[PDB]
Design goal:
This is part of a larger assembly, with two copies of chain A, one copy of chain B, two copies of chain C, two copies of chain D and one copy of chain E. Chain A is mainly alpha-helical. Chain A has six helices and no strands. Chain A is globular and about 40 Å long. By secondary structure, chain C is mainly alpha-helical. Chain C contains 23 helices and no strands. Chain D is extended and about 40 Å long. The chains are: A mainly alpha, B alpha+beta, C mainly alpha, D mainly alpha, E mainly alpha. Chains C and H meet through helix 1, helix 2 and helix 4 of C and helix 1, helix 2, helix 3, helix 4 and helix 9 of H. Strand 1 (48-50) of chain E pairs antiparallel with strand 1 of chain F. Chain E: This is Anaphase-promoting complex subunit 9. Chain E: The APC/C is composed of at least 13 subunits that stay tightly associated throughout the cell cycle: APC1, APC2, APC4, APC5, APC9, APC11, CDC16, CDC23, CDC26, CDC27, DOC1, MND2 and SWM1. Chain E: It is found in: Cytoplasm; Nucleus. Chain E: It comes from Saccharomyces cerevisiae (strain ATCC 204508 / S288c).
């Protein structure tokens, strides 16, 4: 447990570093590894939400829009970035746009769960 | 024909064009072909399956 | 409490009350994770021809191996489903236990292993499996009867096996069970001993005119060609049970030899209206045609009988006879070779193949096959005459 | 290619019948299935089966 | 006892396959390990250890950022690269090396070509495909 | 100064030569160890690095284990990687990880074990219904299983979700090849490679379908295009070797077979093809060595035992030939020609009692050639 | 099929199993002498002095298991 | 002495060694010569799929008048032998009588009810099943067979459930009553079924039981909570995929969700699992009609209807195929016959009224929408129509 948190943090920094450069397959594998590792931890902890958002972002970036759309649809309410990925996938495929609307309207109205984060591509 | 009237539908369908060769290899006719050695129990069930079972290529 | 539900489930299952029995079995299983209740549920699933559900029930929790009886049930369901590979997987290639008032559990598993090997046409391994099964527990009878009926052992080896096994388990019933098992042994060897044994069993005990004693008498008469007594005994037994499949092959052969066309037609129609699936009916129809000099047509019905039931010596031997009787001598050899290979342990196919080799006027091969047949059967007028 | 004959009776035409005494089976779900496939048929089902049967090529 | 859990998630494997896997596995490892059980043990300057077709000398050249007998030396050397250190070439008779060599550059030269239109006509390819 | 080396490696991989690109991928790994894409690039070739100094000089240990798994998979040694999956990579990563499922299924499919690959990355398909990458392995496995319903499920799902992905049209073509048709499958693979070039598997399947269509030149051209797209692909090399064998020219057949075997050392089919090429060349002593390796490498393989027995009977090692034929029969009784060699060996050794039964079995198996079996029976006594 | 000449200038079909002709082919100015069979057994050729070549159309294992492991 | 042989015979029946079972049963019967031994041998013959031997052996010495179990076994053998008039003659049309196990009179009454159901005189079948369930409550078949084919309106089912007494169970009645209560019809008194569901879930760890899950799925099916069918019956189908009771609801809730891949997979597996069951062909028909290939749906619904006459789903799907094909004159008689065959079931009447809308005769459709609405106060179809 002492080193368990360190591995997750280091992995998160690795995915951010990989996404910062135009290196996407490595980001794909690293996000996949973090998403698989975070399975044991409970849904209430933030780390699961951040890992799911990173995995969805990596899937969206790699043109595999369907998998990113499904993954984000699973946990769309938990994080704002997951909702962003859901909206991007909905615009790209024109599938399930209504659910995207019912999520984004609530997230925008409430602002003006997890809402803010330090991760990359966190929307404003 | 008289002695053949005593069949079930599926059993007769199995035996519609059945031909048994001397060496034991049996050929079964589908109204594909089910050429295989007899005296193994699985082949007859496989002929039954492709006879009454449903197979669909589905594009 | 739970015991009342368990006994109610048992009684419903015995009474063919399938819905209630499965219902109570499922709930007694959900109440307590006792694998015997799972075995009972699998039994109910097996009884109404729902094998896959029982297999998946016993496999889902991996409770097989914890207790042997559920393993036996799963293996039996697999062999019924013809997935022999997985049945051999769960049972094992050989005996794993090799160093109550019922049949020992390990003996049943070895019987199932022997049956699976027999289905896979591995006769050499099926033989040792059945021998081990009968040796481990003498309470078992299915392995003994399967070995005797399918002629997986030579008559001398069958007698040696019978002498080797003891009857210590039965105790008080030792002599009566010795005689009862001795009823079913193969002929051609010291038949007078069997006559004495069935004579002792007839008058001393109330089993004077039962099904198997008269079946043995019919077999003795048929081997000795005492066809008058053959027909008499077969009639006085069939008058009681009109569809006893144990005696029908001998009865049909007896009628063919006597050329009772009219009785044969009655039997053929009666079995056609009642048992169209079983190969006995179509064997009867084929031999009715055979008695009328219809070899060319009877070939098809022998083929039908062979297909509807494998491991039937009568059907395939009659098919080879239809081949050899009229012309087309070339592939009668192949038919007899198939008979010999697929039915090992009987001198008759080897003798027939040697006879046919004589018919083509090839001599050395005939002599070799006949010495093989004499090795298989020492006491038979046919082989020594040939 | 011959299909299965139903029954083996070869009585054929006859002036007088002995077995026939007027009797009808009770309506059962198969009968309403049968009368239904007959509703779309302008001819007898037996004649339809004969015509639908394939002649030998 | 020999562990076979990873080979098949089914907890029970028939004994014939147990020996079939054990015999096959030891031979496969013994080929790689030598140019015993699997469950007891699984173990055993430029980063680049190896590349297909390069000898040790080629690696050193990379790290620095770079007549009958003689042809026979060039005869064998090319097949050292193409066959990834195959030991059968030494067992091949000399005159069998020539024809395979002639076909070697012939098939290689064919790769070089493979690795290397009017408006009306060139539209049909897209429509027809 | 880490991704630049990766770009150098990729451009070298793409344009002319793999050696310099693998070198620069190794340099990139030297700058930073977490560039998994470079590791995939190097593992696409049969090239390896010294992982102990890369990853050390528990996340690094996990990464090292995964690197060893990929290196073993690329090197085609599935047994060690399966064992590491057993010991390291605990379950809550192993089952969930889609890429681990891909690799594990490919590993099991490399071995003759077929049902387990189906189970594993069928669980994968359940986890990610829209996954398209590396599904040609499911297509090939389903073709090998001669199963049509799951192949149809795959084709319909992939057509519904991605009409345009190359894997989808490849699966459609594999299904068409499976059912009855070859020209439709050829058209299928042509469209599949038209939409996306550099897909060597499409060209390999094109060549296989052309070969099954008795068109040698088209199959050769498809295989050469596959090699141009991908320098290292043993399937197209094996296809070319089989084409050369059917043409009868054994020299380039042996060349192609050995080239295919070099990158896939453990494969009984490639070993047997190389041994047959050697026997055609006449190297009896060397041919046994590969066959001897093949039989020990994987028992329960009909072709390896059959060729072993044929070669031993050719130069008369009857003592070992008798037992290799006996076990060949034990693992399968339906071989027609094999029982003939069984009987020949039995008669040569001088055990007539087994010879008679064996020739009887052979006569049962082959109705047409019974006369020659009859002649051998005459020669038996 | 059998050629003919000097009597009817025709061709006769034959079935050796049942001994019954099926069809007769004629239409040659001079006698027919030259005949032959095709590869598929369908086409047949006639030779006669009429400078005609008449073409009729009367008719129409585990080793491979190891082959099909690699695809 | 005989007791050891009896235990051996019982073990032989237990281990499914039928040849030995018949051997030992015959030996013990010849020794003792008592009718119970004949019953055991007849049961062995019945299990060996040889009914003629069993009926002949029972009838030979006229044992049916000696015990009460031999006659029941002979009647059941006649039933599965496709003979009804003589079976009923042996058993008797009416009641001749008007510790563990169950009383045999209840089993005989249930067999009479099954004969009547096979003979289509449905009112007599209702009478027989009601008498069987009132005489004995351990005979759960007298309840399940009655409720499965909807032989009676749910109201009288509830009244008979209230009327029948669980007192003789005693200590186990506390669960037996709720467990029997679970299986009644769901349209009326829906809340009580839910309270009983939680009652079973608590204090008895039966939340994992398949029957509770099936009742939950049917609850969700009625209120048209189709997504809940999908989730729950997917959870339970993973554990058991061939529960014949659960499958029809899954097929319906799948069709409503309009997904073809899952239904294709399930139907194609079931076709090669249970070729002679009507459920698999009904599933195939649902798949084709989800694919809008009505012509094949016609035949593949006809096959399912023929295989099981009391499979109202097949009748309704057949009439749906007729309606969707384009012609309605025959579909009119289709919904008419479906309504006549299954009295007390509102849905065929509703579909008949909808076709009446399609043909523009509203006078009659008023009455059938009223009778359908009498029992279904809250569901989208009734209110929309």
């Amino acid at each position: 447990d002492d080193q368990a948190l360190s591995t997750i943090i280091q992995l998160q920094d690795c995915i951010q570093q990989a996404i910062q450069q135009l290196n996407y397959s490595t980001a794909e594998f690293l996000a996949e590894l973090l998403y698989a590792e975070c399975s044991i931890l409970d849904k209430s902890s933030v780390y699961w939400s951040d890992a799911v958002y990173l995995y969805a972002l990596s899937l969206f970036l790699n043109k595999s829009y369907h998998t990113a759309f499904q993954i984000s649809k699973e946990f769309k309410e938990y994080h704002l970035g997951i909702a962003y990925i859901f909206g991007r996938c909905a615009l790209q495929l024109s599938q399930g746009v209504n659910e995207a609307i019912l999520t984004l309207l609530s997230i925008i109205n409430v602002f003006s769960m997890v809402l803010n984060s330090n991760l990359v591509h966190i929307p404003d | 024909r008289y002695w053949n009237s005593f069949h079930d539908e599926d059993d007769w369908n199995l035996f519609n064009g059945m031909e048994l060769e001397s060496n034991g290899v049996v050929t079964f006719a589908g109204q594909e072909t089910i050429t295989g050695s007899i005296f193994d129990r699985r082949i007859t069930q496989l002929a039954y399956a492709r006879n009454n079972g449903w197979h669909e290529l589905a594009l | 409490a739970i015991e009342r539900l368990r006994l109610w489930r048992f009684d419903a299952l015995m009474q063919h009350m399938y819905r209630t029995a499965e219902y109570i079995a499922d709930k007694v299983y959900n109440i307590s994770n006792d694998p015997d209740d799972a075995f009972w549920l699998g039994q109910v699933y097996y009884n109404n021809n729902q094998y896959v559900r029982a297999v998946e029930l016993i496999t889902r929790n991996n409770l097989d191996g914890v207790n042997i009886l559920c393993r036996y049930l799963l293996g039996l369901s697999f062999v019924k489903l013809q997935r022999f590979d997985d049945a051999l997987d769960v049972i094992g290639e050989y005996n794993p236990f090799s160093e109550d008032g019922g049949i020992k559990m390990e003996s049943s598993l070895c019987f199932l292993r022997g049956k699976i090997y027999f289905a896979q046409n591995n006769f050499n391994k099926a033989r040792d499996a059945f021998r081990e099964a009968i040796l481990v527990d003498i309470k078992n009878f299915e392995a003994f009867e399967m070995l005797l009926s399918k002629n997986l052992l030579t008559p001398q080896e069958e007698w040696d096996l019978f002498d080797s096994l003891d009857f210590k388990e039965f105790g008080e019933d030792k002599e009566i069970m010795k005689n009862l098992y001795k009823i079913n042994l193969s002929k051609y060897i010291n038949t007078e001993d069997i006559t004495k044994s069935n004579e002792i069993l007839a008058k001393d005990y109330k089993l004077a005119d039962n099904v198997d004693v008269v079946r043995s008498k019919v077999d003795i008469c048929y081997t000795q060609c005492k066809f008058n007594e053959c027909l008499e005994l077969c009639e006085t037994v069939l008058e009681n049970d009109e569809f006893n499949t144990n005696i029908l092959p001998a009865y049909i052969g007896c009628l063919y030899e006597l050329s009772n066309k009219n009785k044969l037609f009655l039997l053929s129609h009666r079995l056609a209206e009642t048992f169209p699936k079983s190969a006995i009916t179509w064997f009867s129809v084929a031999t009715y045609y055979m008695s009328l000099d219809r070899i060319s047509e009877a070939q098809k019905y022998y083929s039908k009988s062979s297909i509807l039931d494998p491991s039937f010596a009568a059907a395939w031997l009659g098919f080879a006879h239809t081949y050899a009787l009229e012309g087309e001598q070339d592939q009668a050899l192949t038919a007899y070779s198939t008979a010999s290979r697929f039915f090992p342990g009987m001198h008759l196919p080897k003798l027939f193949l040697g006879m046919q080799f004589m018919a083509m006027n090839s001599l050395n091969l005939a002599e070799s096959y006949f010495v093989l047949a004499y090795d298989i059967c020492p006491n038979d007028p046919l082989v020594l005459n040939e | 290619e011959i299909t299965r004959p139903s029954s083996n009776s070869v009585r054929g035409a006859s002036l007088l019948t002995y077995q026939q005494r007027k009797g009808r089976r009770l309506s059962a779900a198969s009968l309403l299935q049968s009368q239904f496939f007959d509703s779309m048929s302008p001819v007898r089902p037996d004649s339809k089966q004969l015509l639908l049967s394939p002649g030998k090529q | 006892q020999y562990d076979y859990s990873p080979f098949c998630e089914r907890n029970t494997l028939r004994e014939s396959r147990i020996d079939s896997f054990l015999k096959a596995e030891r031979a496969a490892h013994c080929l790689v390990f030598h140019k015993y059980r699997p469950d007891i043990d699984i173990m055993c300057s430029m980063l680049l250890e190896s590349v297909p077709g390069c000898n040790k000398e080629d690696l050193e050249r990379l790290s620095r950022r770079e007549r009958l007998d003689d042809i026979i030396n060039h005869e064998t050397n090319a097949l050292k690269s193409f066959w990834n250190d195959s030991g059968l070439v030494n067992s091949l008779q000399s005159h069998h090396l020539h024809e395979e060599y002639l076909l070697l550059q012939e098939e290689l030269k064919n790769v070089y070509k493979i690795k290397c239109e009017s408006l009306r006509d060139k539209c049909r390819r897209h429509y027809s495909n | 100064l880490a991704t630049l080396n990766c770009l150098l490696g990729n451009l070298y991989m793409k344009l002319d030569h793999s050696k310099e690109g693998a070198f620069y991928h190794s340099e990139a790994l030297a700058i930073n160890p977490y560039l998994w894409e470079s590791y995939e690039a190097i593992c696409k070739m049969r090239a390896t690095v010294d992982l102990k100094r890369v990853f050390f000089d528990t996340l690094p240990e996990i990464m090292y284990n995964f690197a060893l798994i990929l290196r073993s998979s690329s090197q085609y040694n599935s047994f060690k990687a399966i064992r590491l999956f057993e010991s390291q990579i605990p379950s809550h990563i192993k089952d969930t990880m889609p890429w681990c499922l891909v690799q594990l299924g490919k590993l099991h499919f490399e071995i003759i074990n077929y049902d387990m690959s189906l189970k594993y990355f069928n669980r994968l398909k359940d986890l990610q219904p829209a996954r398209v990458k590396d599904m040609e392995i499911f297509s090939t496995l389903l073709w090998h299983l001669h199963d049509k319903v799951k192949s149809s499920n795959l084709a319909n799902g992939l057509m519904d979700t991605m009409p345009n992905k190359p894997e989808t049209w490849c699966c459609i073509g594999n299904l068409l090849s499976l059912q009855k048709d070859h020209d439709a499958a050829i058209k299928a693979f042509e469209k599949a490679t038209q939409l996306d070039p550099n897909f060597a598997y499409a060209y390999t399947l094109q060549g296989h379908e052309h070969s099954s269509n008795d068109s040698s030149d088209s199959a050769k051209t498809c295989y050469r295009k596959a090699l141009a797209c991908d320098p290292q692909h043993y399937n197209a090399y094996y296809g070319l070797g089989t084409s050369a064998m059917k043409l009868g020219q054994y020299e380039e057949a042996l060349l192609y077979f050995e080239k295919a075997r070099s990158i896939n050392p453990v494969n009984v089919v490639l070993i047997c093809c190389c041994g047959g090429s050697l026997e055609k060349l006449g190297y009896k002593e060397k041919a046994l060595q590969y066959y001897e390796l093949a039989c020990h490498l994987q028992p329960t393989s009909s072709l390896s035992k059959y060729k072993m027995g044929q070669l031993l009977y050719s130069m008369t090692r009857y003592n070992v030939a008798l037992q290799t034929f006996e076990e060949l029969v034990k693992l399968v009784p339906d071989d027609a020609t094999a029982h003939y060699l069984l009987g020949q060996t039995y008669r040569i050794v001088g055990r007539k009692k087994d010879a008679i039964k064996e020739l009887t079995v052979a006569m049962n198996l082959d109705p047409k050639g019974n006369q020659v079996i009859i002649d051998e029976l005459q020669k038996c006594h | 099929v059998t050629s003919h000449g000097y009597s009817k200038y025709n061709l006769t079909l034959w079935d050796c199993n049942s001994m019954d002709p099926i069809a007769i082919l004629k239409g040659h100015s001079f006698r027919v002498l030259h005949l032959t069979l095709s590869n598929d057994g369908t086409t047949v050729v006639s030779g006669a002095g009429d400078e005609t070549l008449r073409y009729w159309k009367l008719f129409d294992s585990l080793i491979f298991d190891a082959f099909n492991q690699i695809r």
